[PDB]
Structure 1
Amino acid sequence: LDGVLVPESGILVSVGQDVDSVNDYASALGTIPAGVTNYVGIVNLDGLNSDADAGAGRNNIAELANAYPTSALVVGVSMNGEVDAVASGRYNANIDTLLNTLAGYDRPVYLRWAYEVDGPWNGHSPSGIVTSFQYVHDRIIALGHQAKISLVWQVASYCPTPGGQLDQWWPGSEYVDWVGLSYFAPQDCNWDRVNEAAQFARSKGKPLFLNESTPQRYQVADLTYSADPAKGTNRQSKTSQQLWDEWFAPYFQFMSDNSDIVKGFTYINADWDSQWRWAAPYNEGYWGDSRVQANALIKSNWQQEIAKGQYINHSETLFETLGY
């Protein structure tokens, strides 16, 4: 909290966003990720101490924390459509349990509270978001966990939502440690939404975390792309180099272009297509397959990029580098 877990320099490399996909990445790449990512819902604390699987991969923060004891923990917290009731205090015991549990892991924790704050589908009110960020920031201090938990305000940076509407969601610089964004199909509006989020973070003097990232609508194993965000029709064959150059190269270039502020990313490395929420016939959008290990060229290029010196990977000095 209050900036102590923001690295002075470098970009935290983390992976997500379910236990099994993270394990598959770690095994396939022969690496311990520097950060690992799961989700919990505030209403039930689903996924905190036992399995939760709502079709977007299995979440189990206890299992994940035990499997990656010397990695940073990144946790998205959904309001489950109830941010106003959360702001009114109906989930305060759950908030304390969440914060106390995460602090008990004695490691850097990056907490994406009410993540995708401005995604209309989340049913948030601006007041509920602003109030609950203030509450959680202050409660972290009251519980004595300010050295352990860093509070991320993550926007959706989603092209179909009009730009210019971020201010209403902002709780104040006193209450936020990072601005976060989602990097999926930013090319659909010429990077306008992700650039707006970056510029907002920059203006506020906050570091930027790319909290959700994936080559959305691409399939790594199949080597295809679809222009259809709903159902992935009319798939087009791509070479592996094309897939790299179309999505991966501009993703890493975005970090470089925003190197004054970018201090972390979570790459979602998963066969989305195999997870029932994201599966055929695609009732909640078309996602694809983002496993870098599913193509030799993608895997090699991924490994080569993240090995570079601007990136913070796993080592014995990781926690110190992250301010822990």
Structure 2
Amino acid sequence: TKPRFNYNAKYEPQTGIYHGAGQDKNGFQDYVNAVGQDKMPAIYMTYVNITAPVKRIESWGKDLKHVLDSLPKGIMPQIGLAFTGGKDTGAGLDKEVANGKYNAQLEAFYKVLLDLDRPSFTRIGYEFEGDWNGYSPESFKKVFITISKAFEEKNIKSATVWCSGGGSANFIGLEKLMAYYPGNEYVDWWGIDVFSPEEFSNIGLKNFFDTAHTHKKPVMIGESTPRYVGVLDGEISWNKWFKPFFEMLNDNPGIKAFCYINWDWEYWSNKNGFPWHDWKDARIEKNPFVLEAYKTEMENPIFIHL
């Protein structure tokens, strides 16, 4: 495990990698029960869509407060903040948000963060370049800058994360990525989501880490799961996805946080109507080999729990 770089970013740990998991209250608890109470993640994954009614943002916040207060103190929420008008249908609403149409929702979102009054991360328009979200570069940047300036003006305890869809969005070149980039002054962390096992050996992944480092920003794996692999084949599942995953964390000193999604993706696709039906079963507690191998990785001192 290579020693980490340190960029002195907001909420960036000095030497380790934050342990994160998600992405619902019961899946999180099942995961913690499986890896051990002493390896409780420091990061809890949650999501909110800024184009929902104001009362839904308000109830998202109240439910999140209750869950966080039910857990040990100090957990940092990692918020996937979307602005879309459909479930992975390309229905980006970023131009409308840029124009003020959802200012009331944004105010409700800021209020939740001020009420939580604790360190957190906001992935603003996460997976910004994926065609399932359909964000446009110029309106994406305006929204990002607006929320980042509001965080600073309100002294909100949240670090902004500029989070790429990575291989799922075909590892677009750096010039195309920079069309979405609001500038170092508005971005606390970079982020990338890692899903299909082929992504680990794709040169696009290396190139992303290379340029994050020269932007002097730490990297969060904002979302990860053994997509199309699952856990149910034991050593076969481990070697196909988990082994390269932890190799990736070891080999890239700019990675300072990771978030593992402990989900039965078939179940959640049917329940929430998203198109993840064949992503396979990522619940590590459902296979003894993977559970034990994963627990062993979490004993690596590089990982920051609690």
CA distance in structure 2 between the partners assigned to 1:46 and 1:187 by the alignment: 41
SS of the aligned residue for 2:205 comes to helix
- What pairs up with 1:92-111 in 2 under 5 angstroms? 92-111=103-122
Matched, 1:25 2:36: no
CA distance in structure 1 between the partners assigned to 2:100 and 2:83 by the alignment: 13
Aligned CA distance change for structure 1 residues 279 and 103 (closer, same or farther; 3 Å):
closer
Over aligned residues, Cα RMSD in angstroms? 2.4
* 2:259 match: 266
Please identify, of 267-276 and 180-189, the stretch whose mean Cα deviation from structure 2 is larger.
Answer: 180-189
Please identify, of 132-141 and 189-198, the stretch whose mean Cα deviation from structure 2 is larger.
Answer: 189-198
Matched, 1:245 2:239: yes
SS of the aligned residue for 2:132 comes to helix
> Is the CA contact (8 Å cut-off) linking 1:103 and 1:149 kept in structure 2?
no
Matched, 1:149 2:139: no
Superposition deviation, residue 276 in structure 1: 3.2
Structure 1: which amino acid aligns with 2:75? S
Aligned CA distance change for structure 1 residues 160 and 114 (closer, same or farther; 3 Å):
closer
SS of the aligned residue for 2:81 comes to strand
> Is the CA contact (8 Å cut-off) linking 2:229 and 2:240 kept in structure 1?
no
Superposition deviation, residue 189 in structure 1: 7.9
* Unaligned stretches of 5+ residues in structure 2: 1-7, 85-91
Cα deviation digits, residues 199-254 of structure 1 (max 9, x gap): 2311211100001100001232x32xxxxxxxxxxxxxxxx122112211111111
* 1:229 match: none
- What pairs up with 1:81-160 in 2 under 5 angstroms? 81-145=92-156, 148-159=157-168
CA distance in structure 2 between the partners assigned to 1:118 and 1:160 by the alignment: 7
- What pairs up with 1:184-195 in 2 under 5 angstroms? 184-187=195-198, 190-195=201-206
> Is the CA contact (8 Å cut-off) linking 1:178 and 1:206 kept in structure 2?
yes
Superposition deviation, residue 258 in structure 1: 0.8
Superposition deviation, residue 7 in structure 1: 1.2
* 2:249 match: 255
Superposition deviation, residue 64 in structure 1: 2.8
Cα deviation digits, residues 250-274 of structure 1 (max 9, x gap): 1111112111x11101000111121
Aligned CA distance change for structure 1 residues 199 and 82 (closer, same or farther; 3 Å):
same
CA distance in structure 1 between the partners assigned to 2:200 and 2:288 by the alignment: 30
Cα deviation digits, residues 78-116 of structure 1 (max 9, x gap): 111211111112222221221221232232111011000
Q: Give TM-score, length-normalised by structure 2.
A: 0.86
Q: Aligned match of 1:62 in 44, 62, 65? A: 65
Aligned CA distance change for structure 1 residues 90 and 39 (closer, same or farther; 3 Å):
same
Structure 1: which amino acid aligns with 2:285? Q
SS of the aligned residue for 1:217 comes to coil
Q: Aligned match of 2:280 in 274, 284, 288? A: 288
Superposition deviation, residue 194 in structure 1: 2.6
> Is the CA contact (8 Å cut-off) linking 1:158 and 1:186 kept in structure 2?
no
Q: Give TM-score, length-normalised by structure 1.
A: 0.81
Structure 2: which amino acid aligns with 1:202? H
> Is the CA contact (8 Å cut-off) linking 1:85 and 1:91 kept in structure 2?
yes
User: How many pairs does the alignment contain?
Assistant: 286
Aligned CA distance change for structure 1 residues 178 and 253 (closer, same or farther; 3 Å):
same
SS of the aligned residue for 1:111 comes to strand
CA distance in structure 2 between the partners assigned to 1:254 and 1:16 by the alignment: 20
> Is the CA contact (8 Å cut-off) linking 2:209 and 2:252 kept in structure 1?
yes
Superposition deviation, residue 49 in structure 1: 4.2
CA distance in structure 2 between the partners assigned to 1:49 and 1:272 by the alignment: 27
Q: Aligned match of 2:81 in 68, 77, 83? A: 77
Superposition deviation, residue 46 in structure 1: 7.7
SS of the aligned residue for 1:66 comes to helix
Aligned sequence identity (%): 28
* 1:178 match: 189
Q: Aligned match of 1:163 in 169, 172, 183? A: 172
* Unaligned stretches of 5+ residues in structure 1: 53-58, 224-239, 315-324
Cα deviation digits, residues 282-303 of structure 1 (max 9, x gap): 9555211111111112111111
Matched, 1:207 2:218: yes
* 2:59 match: 50
Structure 2: which amino acid aligns with 1:129? F
Structure 2: which amino acid aligns with 1:39? Y
Point out the structure with the larger helix share. 2
Cα deviation digits, residues 183-210 of structure 1 (max 9, x gap): 1015158323332322231121110000
